[PDB]
Write a protein that binds this ligand. Structure first.
Ligand code: NAD
Ligand code: NAD
Ligand code: NAD
Ligand code: BGC
Ligand code: BGC
Ligand code: BGC
Lengths: 344, 350, 350
C-alpha cells in the first residue's frame, strides 16, 4: 500500500554494514535501498564507487543515512541533503558544536525529517528505565552518572583513533551514548555549567596497549585521550557525573550505562565489557524495607521506528535537539582544558 | 603512663575511644566530661582510673592539671573552642575526624597547636585498616604509578545517624559531606600524596531528608523530616594542580544501591585499586587492577581504633609524629568546605 | 497501668518467646506463674520480678488469683481449650499457636471469649516479621491484585522437635500439620485476606516418623520411632468460595531438599510474591515478581516475638483489637482439621 521509501546511504563502512543494511534488510518491507559490495549486497540502482558525490545520484532518493566519520557529518549533511531530503546521521551528531548547530538549521528550514544514531535508546532495559522516569516513578532525579568506561578496549580497526575524522577519543566515541541515555531519562537538558578533565596517560605509554581487548595499538601515534571525567550542573540543581575511557586502570568496564538518583527511587543500568548480560536494577524503600528490583535487537528496532516516522509523518524517537545538547556538553568537557568551568 | 581526659562521652567515646584506651592500658588511665553529666559518670565507673573526675563542664576538666592529653569527642562546632588554647593552653589534644566544619576555625586550631609546642592529631582511624595501609604502601612505592583519577566513596542508601544531633546545623555544621566524606577524601589524598588543590566544584542535595517517606528503610531508625537541617547528599569534583581529578560522593540517604563508605578508587599509570567498605560490604575489600604479561588481572585479599590509639599515645610518650598530620586534616576540611561553597553555583579556585 | 500477667506453662515457648518479650516490654507489664512441674515455674518465677508470685502447681488457682489480669496459655495443645474456657471466665487470654487441635474445642474457645467481654489473641507471631508485614501491606494495597493461587510452606526436611511433647498425640492432638502448618496457613490466608473456604482435600503421611532410620539426620538429635504418635507430613488442597486455591505442605521429616516453613507463595493478577524462611534460609527473604514496562522483574530485600507481645499488651490497655483475631485463628484450625478429616478418603466441603 504505502510506497516503500527510497533510501540513501552516503558512507558505507562499519555502522553502515554492521547496522543500517541489516536493519533495512530485517525491515526491507518498508525501505528502498537505491565498500563495493553494498549496492549489490542490498539494493537495482546506484553504484558501489568510493566517492561522496556519486551519491547525489538518483536524487529521487527521499531519505539519506550519513554514516561518514564525525567531521564529514556537517557537510555530507546539511544543505547537502537539506537540499530537500530526510537525514539520519550517525551516533555523534558532530564532533564540533558549531557544525552540529549548522545542521539543526539546515534541517529546521528544510522541513524534512532528521534523527541520530543513538540506538542504545532502544535496548529493552533502557526503554524500561525511560518509561519509569517518564511515569515519575523515580521522582525528581537530581543526581545521575553516565558510565562509558573501558579498562582496556581501545578500538584498533577503523575511524576511531583518527583525531581528524572523529575529533576525539572515548569521550565523543562512547561517552556520547552514556550521556544521551542519562539526559534522556532525566528529561533534563538545561545545562548550567560543565567542568571536565581529559587524560593523556595510557594511550602513549609503551606498555599502555598491554591487555587491550582488540589487540595492540601504536602509542607513538595515539593522538586522542584515553579517558575523561565530567561534572555537569543542570539549571535545576541536578548534577551529572561522567566518566568515559578506552583505557583506564579501573575494574568495572561499564559503558552505555547510567545511574539515576531520584526523590522517590533509584535505578542503574549495567552494560559493557564487564557484563555478559545487560542489567537494570531499581532501588527503593517499600513498606519500610530497602529493596532492589532486578531483571529476571535494538539495531533493527531503531531503524524500523525511523522509517515509520517519515512514512506516517510522525516524530522519530531520537530528536535532533537532544543529540545537539549531548554534543554541546561533551565539547564543553574538552573545553575545560582552559582549566575553567564552562557556563551555558 | 599517660593521663587522659575524655570530653564528650557520646557514641564515639564508648564505641571507639574507651575500648581503645583500655586495650592500650599499659600507656594510659582515664580521669570524664559531657554536658549530660550522667554519661560522664557511667563512663567513669567503667574506664575511670580509680579516683577520677566527672565534670559536665569542659572548662573544668582542662583545669585539672593531672590530665595531659585530651580527646575532643564533641559535635563539630565545639571542636574549635575546646582544643584552642582551651586544649592547647592545657595539653596535647586528639580531636575527632571532622576537625572543624569551618575552614577558618580549623585554621585557628592549627595556629593554636603550633603556638603551644604540643602534639596534635585528628581521628581518621579508617587509614590504619590494613587494606588502607596496603594501598598507601603501594602508592608510596609507586606500584600504581602516578594517580590521575581518584574517587572518594562515602555513600549510604539509608543509614542517617539518629543517636545525637548529626542533623543540627548549629552543632554539627553540616551533614554527610563532613560526617563521612572526610574519611574517604583523606584516604584518597593520603594515598595519592596530593593535597595541592586548584579547583573545587560541587553540588549539595537536600531532598530525601525532609520527605515524609524519606526515613523509610533507614538503618538506625526513623527520623523527623522536619528537624533535618543538613543535606542528605553531596557530590564533588576536585582538580589538583598536577592535573589529577578526584570525585567525591557523600550521603546518609541516597537512592543508590552501593553503600560504600571510607572507600577509594585510584586509577594510575601503572595500575589502580579499589577499597570496598560500607553498609553494603560485610567484609572490607581491596582489589588491585593491572596488566601483567599482556593479560588484565585483579589482585584481591585472600582493630583500627586500637592501633590508631596506640600509635598516638606512643608518639607523645616517645616524642614523635602521629600518623594523621593536622595539615592533612586541614586540607580535607578546606576541600569539603569548598564543596559547600559551590552553593554559589561557582567553581572555587584555590 | 502496668498489666498483671499470669503464665500457665513455663517451658519452651514461655521460656523462649514469652518471658523474654514480656521482659522486653516490662514497662507495660509485671508477671504474677504456673506449670505442672511445681518447680518449672520457679527458675522464672524468680527470674521474672514476680515479687509475690502465686507461682502455683495448679492453673485453676492462678486463675482464682484476683491480681491476674492477662493469662498466657503456653501449655500443650490439648490444654489450650480448658485453660483458655476457664480463664475467659474473667481474664484476657493469649493462647499459643495451635489454638486447638480440634475445631470444636476451638469453637468452644471462641464462644467463651464472647461470653467474657475480654481480649483474645493467638500466638501467630510470624505475622510480625518485617517482611511478612511487607507482603501483607502490599496485598492490602492491591499491589498483587486478586490473589488466586497460594502455597503455604511448612516443610522441614528433618527437624522433628524432640524436647517437649510434640510427638505425643494425647497432648498435641496432631503433628506437623498443626505444629507448623498453622504458621504458614495463617500467613497465607491473612495476606490473601480470604477466609471463605469451599473444599479441603488432604493427605497425611505416616512413613518416616515410625521408620527405623528416619531419625537419621534429625536436626535436633534422634527420637524413638515407637513413641512417634503423629504424622511426619501432610499435604492439603484448599479451594475457596471466591475461586482461589491454596496449596499446603507441612513436615517435620520428609525427603525434600528445601526446608521452608512459616513462608508463603502468592500469585496475583498484578504481581506475585514468595517469602523464604526455615532451616534452609540463614536469612529471611521476600521476593516480589511482576512484569514492569514489558520485562519480567523480581524485587528482593536488600525482632517479631517482642513486637507481638507489645501490641497485645497495648491492645489490652487502649481497649483496641489485637492484630491476630480469634476468628482468623479458628479458620486456620478448621482447614487443618479438614486436611486430617480427609482420613475419610474424601474432599471435605464447607
Ligand atoms: N554504535 C554506533 O552507533 C556507532 C558505532 C560506530 C560508529 N558510529 C559512527 O559512525 C560513523 C562512522 O564510523 P564508522 O566506523 O562507520 O566509519 P568507517 O570509516 O568504517 O566508514 C566510513 C567511510 O565513509 C567513507 N566516506 C568518507 N568520507 C566520505 C564522503 N565525504 N563521502 C562519502 N563517503 C565518505 C570513508 O569510506 C569512510 O571510511 C561515525 O560518526 C561513528 O561515530 C556509530
Ligand atoms: N569513625 C570516627 O572516628 C567517628 C565516628 C562517629 C563520630 N565521630 C565524631 O565524634 C563527634 C560526635 O560524637 P558522636 O558520634 O558519638 O555523637 P554523640 O551525640 O553520641 O556524642 C556527643 C556527646 O558529647 C556531649 N556534648 C555535646 N556538647 C558537649 C560539650 N561542650 N562538652 C562535653 N560534652 C558535650 C553530648 O552529650 C554527647 O553525649 C563528632 O565530631 C563526630 O564526627 C567520629
Ligand atoms: N512460635 C510459636 O508460636 C510456638 C513455638 C513453639 C511452641 N508453641 C506452642 O506452645 C505450646 C507449648 O510448646 P512448648 O515448646 O513450650 O512445649 P513445652 O512442653 O516445652 O512447654 C509446655 C509447658 O506446659 C507445661 N504444662 C503441661 N501441662 C500443664 C498443665 N496442665 N498446667 C500447667 N502447665 C502445664 C509443661 O510442664 C511445660 O513446661 C504448644 O501449644 C506449642 O504448639 C508455639
Ligand atoms: O558501540 C559504540 C562504540 O563501540 C565500540 O566498539 C567502538 O569504540 C566504536 O565502534 C563505537 O564508537
Ligand atoms: O555517622 C555515623 C558514624 O558511623 C561510623 O561508622 C563512621 O565512621 C562515622 O564517620 C559516622 O559519623
Ligand atoms: O517444631 C519445633 C517448633 O519450632 C517453632 O518454630 C514452631 O513455631 C513450633 O510450632 C515448633 O513446635
Amino acid at each position: 500500500g504505502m510506497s516503500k521509501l527510497k533510501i540513501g546511504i552516503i558512507g558505507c563502512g562499519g555502522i553502515a554494514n554492521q547496522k543500517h543494511f541489516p536493519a533495512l534488510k530485517n525491515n526491507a518491507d518498508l525501505n528502498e535501498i537505491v565498500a563495493e559490495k553494498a549496492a549489490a549486497e542490498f539494493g537495482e540502482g546506484a553504484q558501489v564507487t568510493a566517492d561522496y558525490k556519486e551519491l547525489l545520484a538518483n536524487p529521487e532518493v527521499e531519505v539519506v543515512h550519513v554514516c561518514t566519520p564525525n567531521v564529514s557529518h556537517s557537510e555530507i549533511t546539511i544543505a547537502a541533503f537539506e537540499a530537500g531530503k530526510h537525514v539520519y546521521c550517525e551516533k555523534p551528531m558532530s564532533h564540533s558544536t558549531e557544525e552540529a548547530e549548522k545542521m539543526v538549521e539546515a534541517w529546521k528550514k528544510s522541513g524534512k525529517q532528521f534523527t541520530i544514531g543513538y540506538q542504545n535508546r532502544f535496548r529493552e532495559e533502557v526503554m524500561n528505565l525511560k518509561k519509569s522516569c517518564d511515569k515519575g516513578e523515580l521522582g525528581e532525579i537530581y543526581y545521575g552518572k553516565a558510565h562509558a568506561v573501558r579498562r582496556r578496549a581501545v578500538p584498533t580497526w577503523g575511524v576511531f583513533m583518527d583525531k581528524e575524522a572523529q575529533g576525539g577519543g572515548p569521550l565523543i566515541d562512547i561517552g556520547t551514548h552514556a550521556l544521551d541515555i542519562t539526559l534522556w531519562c532525566m528529561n533534563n537538558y538545561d545545562v548550567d555549567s560543565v567542568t571536565g578533565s581529559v587524560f593523556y596517560k595510557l594511550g602513549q605509554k609503551e606498555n599502555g596497549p598491554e591487555g587491550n581487548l582488540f589487540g595492540p595499538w601504536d602509542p607513538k601515534t595515539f593522538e586522542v585521550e584515553d579517558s575523561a571525567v565530567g561534572f555537569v550542573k543542570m539549571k535545576n540543581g541536578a548534577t551529572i557525573g561522567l566518566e568515559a575511557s578506552w583505557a583506564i586502570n579501573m575494574l568495572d568496564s561499564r559503558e552505555a550505562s547510567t545511574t539515576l538518583c531520584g526523590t522517590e527511587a533509584g535505578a542503574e543500568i549495567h552494560s559493557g565489557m564487564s557484563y555478559p548480560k545487560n542489567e537494570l536494577i531499581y532501588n527503593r524503600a517499600r513498606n519500610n524495607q530497602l529493596m532492589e528490583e532486578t531483571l529476571s535487537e535494538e539495531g533493527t528496532v531503531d531503524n524500523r521506528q525511523w522509517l515509520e516516522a517519515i512514512q506516517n509523518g510522525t516524530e522519530p524517537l531520537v530528536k535532533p535537539e537532544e543529540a545537539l545538547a549531548v554534543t554541546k556538553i561533551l565539547d564543553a568537557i574538552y573545553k575545560s582544558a582552559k582549566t575553567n568551568t564552562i557556563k551555558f
